[PDB]
């Protein structure tokens, strides 16, 4: 969880040196630890070692692999893992769908990203805030202000206390087209933010009010 790949590797080597067969959960943990630091080869080696010792992969292992590959944009590995899942027969939860969405988003395949989005909407499962966050990010990246603003006004109507991600993505997309009026009108409601402190701090610091040594 903390992305301490070196410590996880040290613990794995220590527990292997004492004739202890590692469990599937421990291997999943070390795999996700290696994937945090973009060390894909070590994560794949650990995943391969899982089968050697008999510790079969679980759904958590596939989720960790999908997230690690999606962060780096390795969508070929994403589709390989999806094929592995489909031939394994494991049901695909929202994690698989949104991991695929963000993998295609980071890989730049916007059209295939929205194709997978509508494929997910067709079958089942309710998209969480993460799925709409991913679709908003992929829309903002591919120079689409209209879809971004539509999704922004649709999602904020659910009284969900919109997160930092949506505000930063909106600021980015508005700065793409030099929509200084939109940036200012978002900042006016962003500055106060009576509910949370993180939004207030980031909104004050982006404008330059916190650049001082005592204010940083």
């Amino acid at each position: 969880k903390g992305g301490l790949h070196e410590d996880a590797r040290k613990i794995l080597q220590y527990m292997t040196a004492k004739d202890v067969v590692p469990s599937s959960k421990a291997y999943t943990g070390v795999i996700e630890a290696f994937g945090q630091a973009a060390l894909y080869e070590e994560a794949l080696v650990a995943f391969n070692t899982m089968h050697e010792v008999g510790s079969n992969p679980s759904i958590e292992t596939f989720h960790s692999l999908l997230y690690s590959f999606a962060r780096g944009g390795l969508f070929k590995e994403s589709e390989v893992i999806l094929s592995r899942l489909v031939n394994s027969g494991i049901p695909r939860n929202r994690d698989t769908f949104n991991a695929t969405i963000e993998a295609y988003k980071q890989g730049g395949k916007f059209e295939e990203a929205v194709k997978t989005y509508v494929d997910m909407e067709k079958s089942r499962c309710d998209p969480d805030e993460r799925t709409l966050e991913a679709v908003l990010s992929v829309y903002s990246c591919a120079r689409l202000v209209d879809e971004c603003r539509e999704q922004f006004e649709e999602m904020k109507a659910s009284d969900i206390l919109p997160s930092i991600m949506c505000y930063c993505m909106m600021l980015s997309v508005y700065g793409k087209t030099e929509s200084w009026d939109d940036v200012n009108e978002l900042l006016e409601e962003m500055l106060s933010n009576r509910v949370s402190n993180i939004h207030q701090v980031i909104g004050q610091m982006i404008k330059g009010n916190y650049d001082d040594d005592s204010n940083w």
């Binding site: 070692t49 050697e52 590995e77 390989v80």
Partner: peptide, 17 residues
């Protein structure tokens, strides 16, 4: 007569591709 003189590595480790 005939009785004389008493008569797995490299697996689960393939290239991921």
């Amino acid at each position: 007569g005939t009785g004389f003189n008493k008569g797995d590595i490299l697996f689960y480790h393939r290239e991921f591709c």
